[PDB]
């Protein structure tokens, strides 16, 4: 979302303390997106569902 | 996709969900193996006793104002619809009850027909075979001629199956296949008891036969989910570019656009119905069953006919 | 615009006339019939012997033919379970013979231009229309 | 949220759910045994799991966004080849098929397919208390009858 | 005996007598068996 009223977009939530560095992996239901994989690398994916 | 080739090949994200299933035969309709006699023995078969030997006391006082053997003999015969020739009792005063209990008659046999009519119309075939870990897909030692297992024996599934399962596919090699259409063909004729490919053409092929028979084992069970792919050069730049624009197509909602040409079909379990002629009524064997114990218990009691000897 | 398709046959459960299960309408229930009449005759003899099965022919059919019950109460015991038995499969053969007569048949035919059958083509179905109409 | 808002033709679908959304999972599987909640939207991987234990509610087949749940890495950690192989090998060698077996699917009530081809019989009150009235008021009718004997 | 009845009934005399019978109840418990059926076939398929 666009946050502070501003042109700045960050990132909400579990992702964003990926990308900050908070973490190094994310070992959750997360599911498989097209705005999620614009800059992050996921794996083959553990399960089949919708 | 699997290991063996990931090594060598880059891949896509996976585009079509599938995996290792198996196809069954397109057996006939079975009803259960027993008659319906799941809990009605819970509450009704034995209160059916505990309020039908209370009216012995009635018996004896229409005789102070016949009881020994001949009252449930009566209390017997038009509960189960019979006419024994039995005695009625004595006196007008002894006619109430059994107007009473008749009924009771009416009312049960009534309900008891109704119940199995519901019940022998809405219950579901059960899938005889389930999963590779039966015994059926292991040694087919006690079978009157034992299970025939297919498989095509160039591609995933053999690489899958010789990795955990040895004797199954060493078992297998007498019994290959040519072809799909040639696989549906010798399941037909008797010649296959079931066949072992992959999940998306078998899920295709169920709905495009010309009879809707039986299709796969469970619903859609299937043992090593993984998807389908598009294989590239390895590390090549044009895979981060192609992995974005497959997501793309699932953002948009187009591959249920694509759906028209894809996997849809005639006869996809779309009833759950089963109609059977009831050769297979031979499982009545239980009520039988029922039927010799006491023809055991006849003789059993025959013995305990003498003991008068000892009193 | 609508498709036209050819009806099929389907049958009636006449051709059943008292056979729906002729293979298993066994004559084992009539061997039944004649063993269990020997059970009550050697059960009566060693505690109304030659017409235990006019006793017991008449537990099966709902026919009252005037005979006279089994003395012994060890015949009794297996008289009850008998015409429980007899009750058993005249009515499961009520409830199978209303199965025949409830059940539909299968073969649904095709719905509209989003059917599989018509969409994607082939050998075995034929489409026609008149030619230089408005289809 | 995000693929909602990514369709247009949904549009109006999502200018409805902006004024009922929740903030975590069981609040709303909770809302919805309270009756404020009517449906609700999620994965199948939690719904055919809720279906099952909480034994009230119920799925209604289709689904529409097929995908799975992945490992999230940070972009270009040296693991991406390592931790991408052993998870094919853990969906080969029967690894999680056994997990879900412990964990998912171990639990069941009745598989909701609506058969009221069953029993309960349980209660018998209604049909045998007409015996139970008849036993109870026979010897008083005996009695009277009886009475009616001796006189004449 | 064809409609399902206790009637306290005379049987005829002699054991020559009692085949028919026999049959006459083979013919009765095959008819009501079809005719409960096709009643209860007849009420769950008619429309309003």
Known sequence: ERVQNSNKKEWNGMMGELLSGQADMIVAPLTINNERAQYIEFSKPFKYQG | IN???????????????????????????????????????????????????????????????????????????????????????????????????????????????????????????????????????????????????????????????????????????????????????????????????????????????????????????????????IAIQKDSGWKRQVDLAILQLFGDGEMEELEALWLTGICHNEKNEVMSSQLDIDNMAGVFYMLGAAMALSLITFISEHLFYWQ | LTILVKKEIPRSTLDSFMQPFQSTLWLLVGLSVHVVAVMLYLLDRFSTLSSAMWFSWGVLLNSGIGEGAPRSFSARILGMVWAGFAMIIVASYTANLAAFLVLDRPEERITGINDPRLRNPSDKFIYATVKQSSV | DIYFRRQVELSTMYRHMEKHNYESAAEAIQAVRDNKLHAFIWDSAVLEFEASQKCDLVTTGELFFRSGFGIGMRKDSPWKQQVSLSILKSHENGFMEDLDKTWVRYQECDSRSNAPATLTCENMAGVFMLVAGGIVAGIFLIFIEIAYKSRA
């Not at chain 2, 290792?20 to 009704?44: Q, W």
């Not at chain 2, 006793?49 to 104002?65: C, H, K, P, Q, R």
């Not at chain 2, 490919?197 to 028979?213: F, I, P, T």
Request: net charge neutral; with cysteine; charged share 15%.
């Open chain 2, 3 to 229: 290991e063996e080739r990931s090594e060598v090949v880059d891949f896509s994200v996976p585009f079509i969900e599938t995996g290792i299933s198996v196809m069954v035969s397109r057996s006939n309709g079975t009803v259960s193996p027993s008659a319906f006699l799941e809990p009605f023995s819970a509450c009704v078969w034995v209160m059916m006793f505990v309020m039908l030997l209370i009216v012995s006391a009635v018996a004896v006082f229409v005789f102070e104002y016949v009881t020994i053997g001949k009252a449930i003999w009566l209390l017997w015969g038009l509960v189960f619809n019979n006419s024994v020739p039995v005695q009625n009792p004595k006196g007008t005063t002894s006619k109430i009850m059994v107007s009473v209990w008749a009924f009771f008659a009416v009312i049960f046999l009534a309900s008891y027909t109704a119940n199995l009519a519901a019940f022998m119309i809405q219950e579901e075939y059960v899938d005889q075979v389930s999963g590779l870990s039966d015994k059926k897909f292991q040694r087919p030692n006690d079978f009157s001629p034992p299970f025939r297992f297919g498989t095509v024996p160039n591609g995933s599934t053999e690489r899958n199956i010789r990795n955990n399962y040895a004797e199954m596919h060493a078992y297998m090699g007498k019994f290959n296949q040519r072809g799909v259409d040639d696989a549906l063909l010798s399941l037909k004729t008797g010649k296959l008891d079931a066949f072992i490919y992959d999940a998306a053409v078998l899920n295709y092929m169920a709905g495009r036969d010309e009879g809707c028979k039986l299709v796969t084992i469970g619903s859609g069970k299937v043992f090593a989910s993984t998807g389908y792919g």
